[PDB]
Design a protein around this ligand. Structure first.
Ligand SMILES: Cc1nc(N)sc1-c1nccn1C
Ligand SMILES: Cc1nc(N)sc1-c1nccn1C
Length: 330
């Protein structure tokens, strides 16, 4: 089997991407944030505290003939921005782009934090990191991808995120029409539960390439590119007037700038992020200070190849017995 679904930016800055997902019988379609940095499939639901729902579509298990309470199971998760959610668990049929999993754990939110409530466009998350990170207790649950894997034509999924445009998540096949050149594969460590790999270095604009190992994670659920302070300082030094602002919470730059590109290495291959992808617009409405899309990872504890990086590539998440990651230009 295979599946193919379109993923769409939630706003004009590509702050996140949503993908329609069918849950239950008859289908209830929710727009979920596919997140290769976490491992829980959770939704806004008929159980979510009413004051914490503001415009989201909710899953109502009592209207699904295939829903079953997973008795005793609870979940609770926090993300890197300090947002969080928690609740109980149902099993139900879940389909993505034509690919169906029966008995998928669907984690129903009882509580969500404010930045979820405020994100009217995101109806929940669909985790695609390794199932060892799943938060369900006392019986950890499998991700949609793990449950689907044995049925897939090939044990892979791909992310093809757009810049200010829709893109695609495919399950079970590589669309050879979706990228240019060849795919370069690189080793993955699953020791921390992430799609963790080592970039071979970087360049700023038309500058020379610096060969240096940068360990980080491929994370579709993180908006920005978070890299070591040394790398990020070298980037922003090429933008007149750019500075790190502790009041704003990162590097800002004059909205009048033309940002340089940023290149990252994948083995001997190179992925170029255009300068436009690094612009996250005014820090507040009408400001002439703009927020940067490359930020320091210092104090996060991990480097994160988030959407800014991943959208510049066609990315293969290879879930074979020994997982790997592939990147192609597009
Ligand atoms: C910051 C973040 N990281 C994720 N993987 S979900 C999440 C999030 N918190 C609030 C809204 N959204 C989309
Ligand atoms: C700030 C910026 N740097 C580029 N290389 S294009 C760009 C920009 N200004 C306005 C819109 N966009 C995308």
């Amino acid at each position: 089997s295979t599946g193919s679904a379109t993923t769409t930016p939630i706003d004009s800055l590509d702050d996140a991407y949503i993908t329609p997902v069918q849950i239950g019988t008859p289908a209830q379609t929710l727009n979920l944030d596919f997140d290769t940095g976490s491992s829980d499939l959770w939704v806004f639901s008929s159980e979510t505290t009413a004051s914490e729902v503001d415009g989201q579509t909710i899953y109502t298990p009592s209207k699904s003939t295939t829903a079953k309470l997973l008795s005793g199971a609870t979940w609770s998760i926090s993300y890197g921005d300090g947002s969080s959610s928690s609740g109980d668990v149902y099993t139900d049929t879940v389909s993505v782009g034509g690919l169906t999993v029966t008995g998928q754990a669907v984690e129903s939110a009882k509580k969500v934090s404010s930045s979820f409530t405020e994100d009217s466009t995101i109806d929940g998350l669909l985790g695609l990191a390794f199932s060892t990170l799943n938060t369900v207790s006392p019986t950890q649950q499998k991700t949609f991808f793990d449950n689907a894997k044995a049925s897939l034509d090939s044990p892979v999924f791909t992310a093809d995120l757009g810049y200010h445009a829709p893109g695609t998540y495919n399950f079970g096949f590589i669309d050879t029409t979706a990228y240019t050149g060849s795919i370069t594969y690189t080793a993955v460590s699953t020791k921390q539960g992430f799609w963790e790999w080592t970039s071979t270095g970087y360049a700023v604009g038309s500058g020379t390439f610096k060969s240096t190992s940068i360990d980080g994670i491929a994370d579709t659920g993180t908006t920005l590119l978070y890299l070591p302070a040394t790398v990020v300082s070298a980037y922003w030094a090429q933008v007149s007037g750019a500075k790190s602002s502790s009041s704003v919470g990162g590097y800002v730059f004059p909205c009048s700038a033309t940002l340089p590109s940023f290149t990252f290495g994948v083995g001997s291959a190179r992925i170029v992020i255009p300068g436009d992808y690094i612009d996250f617009g005014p820090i507040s409405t009408g400001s002439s200070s703009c927020f940067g899309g490359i930020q320091s990872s210092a104090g996060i504890g991990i480097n994160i190849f988030g959407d800014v990086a991943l959208k510049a590539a066609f990315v293969v998440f290879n879930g074979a017995t020994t997982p790997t990651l592939g990147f192609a230009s597009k």
